[PDB]
Amino acid sequence: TVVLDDVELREAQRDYLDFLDDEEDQGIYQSKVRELISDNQYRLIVNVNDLRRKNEKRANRLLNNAFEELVAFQRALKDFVASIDATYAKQYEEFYVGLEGSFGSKHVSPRTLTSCFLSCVVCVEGIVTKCSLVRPKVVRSVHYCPATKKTIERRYSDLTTLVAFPSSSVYPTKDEENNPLETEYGLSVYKDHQTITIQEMPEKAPAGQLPRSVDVILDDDLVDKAKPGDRVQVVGTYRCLPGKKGGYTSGTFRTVLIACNVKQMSKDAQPSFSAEDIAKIKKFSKTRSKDIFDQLAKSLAPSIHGHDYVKKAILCLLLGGVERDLENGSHIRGDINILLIGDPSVAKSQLLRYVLCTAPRAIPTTGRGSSGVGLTAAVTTDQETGERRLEAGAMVLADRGVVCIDEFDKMSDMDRTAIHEVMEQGRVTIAKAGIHARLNARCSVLAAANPVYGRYDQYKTPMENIGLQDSLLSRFDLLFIMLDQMDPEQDREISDHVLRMHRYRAPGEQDGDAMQIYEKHDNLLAFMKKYIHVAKIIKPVLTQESATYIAEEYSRLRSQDSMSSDTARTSPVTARTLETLIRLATAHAKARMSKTVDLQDAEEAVELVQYAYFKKVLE
């Protein structure tokens, strides 16, 4: 029953062959084809706004009736990529078409995935809940008869959504002469298959209501793009399933969402650049490399006044040091960790929310919101196979990322000790009788504790006034003390800054109703993310001069004479402090894009620790 011609399919394939034809235009989709051919990836992502502007009617048709339309799209894609390279187009029996763009009415959530959107490519944000085992599914199965020296290739059609017949589902095992057939597993062809479950986000979902979730069938090309707990935006074809054969049916049609693509809804893996921006960063580095750390430090966290040393230190954190894994796996960490301890109303939590909004893969942990098993990882059984699976915790999620600890003082001693190996080695070695593992959480921690008595007493020593053990304060590599001096002069400073920011408005965008390298220098007062992201990768090695100077300054800090009487130490100088010196030096050099840590960065690091650690308790 081969079709001779259909006007609908011919028209649609012609339209999308034109859409892919990008030479008279800027060459965007031709470039996409060429790069995916170079990559060996076999999905091409077409923006729905592009499709709508070039032909709104086809966008309406496709977003109302997907599968056959996308069959047309993918056949056009195969023809097009064959014209670019027939040899590669022959390689894969199919090529696929992902989507992107403004799915205006077609953006709902699993609470609002009604029965109006069937066979329509719906867009839906949500949190994963499950990750079924990614197991093969046979597509083209080859067999060998040894009695008759015969070979066969049974063929299967992916009728995951249509009606499926036993004649289609037969797996042959005997010839016509009732001989034995041996499967040829290697010569057969398979595609991965995984089920997952998207859920309405609890931050988005209604407050008092049960969760609502939708099932998503990721075939090949989308195997491990979604684990449990992740934020993911899924765009694809909500449809119905066939009940297996049987003379009766209730009307029930359990439905799925055969995802056309899934992307990270975090939108924090954002290295999006242009060559002009690369040149901008390069000049920003090289022209004023020596003052660039202070440029960045003053820049970072606007809408707050002073705390310039803390801004420098949070830069040292975000830029990070450099992790070291020596010959035998002795892993010496390369992350900073900062403890803000200071009076109330000192914007400590505001700094935390700043790094939450800016640093990629930042996550908040409260004192008694998160707790232990939540903080670090966990081991739990499946109950569908009696096998021990592992549930990654907050820190493990924040591997190579940031965690903002609100009210660190209030975490009980059990969790305060549970954070120990993540603090030093960036791993959690968990185990119960079935399964054990060393989950890796190379995290960085910015923690805002509050003082004992609810406010720092100036005359009392910091060790008395902090309700935290010397054991932990060793592991923390910097402890910054933020006092409210209460003087009128600095009060004038802070107050004018604060009320200026209360007066700053969306420029032009607002009327009175409430809700580039450098910045346009607004009197009342992006590239930060770009530059720090590129900065993270560089491994500026320490010079001999820097190593000798940093060593001698550490020896001086260890010696008691370096602190005068009437000052009180805030954190004892263990060797963790030397490693702190090296890490802060590397972070400064990374700010400079140095490719070598020099005496400038070394003396900046020593200045940092000297201000941070030794406090002047007054009488």
């Binding site: 599968f67 009604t114 029965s115 069937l118 066979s119 959504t161 249509l162 009606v163 499926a164 017949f165 449809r239 119905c240 399933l241 066939p242 009940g243 054969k245 003379g247 049916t249 009307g251 049609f253």
Partner: protein
Amino acid sequence: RKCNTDQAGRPKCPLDPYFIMPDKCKCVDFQTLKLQELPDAVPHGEMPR
């Protein structure tokens, strides 16, 4: 239960030949609520219907 063609071939169609076409079903939203009696309506000693 039985295909109605009279033209399936010289032989006839088997018994129970029909498979539901899932895609060609036009469907709707439905919801099974669990309504419980009004607490002030429930008499004294009884249980909520």
